[PDB]
Amino acid sequence: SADDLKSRFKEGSIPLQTDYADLIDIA
Amino acid sequence: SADDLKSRFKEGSIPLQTDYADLIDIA
Amino acid sequence: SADDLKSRFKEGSIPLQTDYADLIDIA
Amino acid sequence: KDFVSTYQRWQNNGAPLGDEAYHVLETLTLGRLPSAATGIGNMRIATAQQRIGVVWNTEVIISNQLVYV
Amino acid sequence: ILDTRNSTALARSLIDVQNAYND
Amino acid sequence: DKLKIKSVPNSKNQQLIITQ
């Protein structure tokens, strides 16, 4: 979900390739 | 806007969580 | 294509501001 | 491609002297002014155990040049 | 006349230089 | 000796002034 994706990108966090995969899957 | 949006993603930058927030917002 | 973008964000790869440019313009 | 993007950006910026200029400088391999940071140009993507190591350990972040927020 | 459009360091540490001026 | 920080409109980039 969108709010989930906002949650995975808060200050102090470091994303993984799954986050980017989900981002590009949102198209 | 889009131009301001990829203004933040210029070389040598560290995007903040807000930029990611608008990135989820547009998608 | 989408999976090219995935493989460019695949773990260990060095992203470039060009890749972010395609990410923005996809949306 | 990256060169073209940064060159166009530097030019419509007014051709100023800065990181936009210094990246072009290093690209033509005749000078460098490394800044105390790690920009988009070089960011390895960390493993999950790297995530568990940092979670907030800054020293590993600066050690492996990972994504920082 | 300084602008941070020509370097991200000021963009990151403008708060810090503000405090440095304060003290 | 005197500095002020002023934000340009229609964008977010930050303009720093200094006098001496």
TrEMBL record, chains A, B, C:
Location of this chain's protein in the cell: Virion
Lineage: Bacteria, Pseudomonadati, Pseudomonadota, Gammaproteobacteria, Enterobacterales
Coverage span on the entire protein: 29 to 55 of 434
UniProt protein name: Tail fiber protein
TrEMBL record, chain E:
Domain of life: Bacteria
Protein's UniProt name: Uncharacterized protein
Parent-protein residues present: 688 to 710 of 968
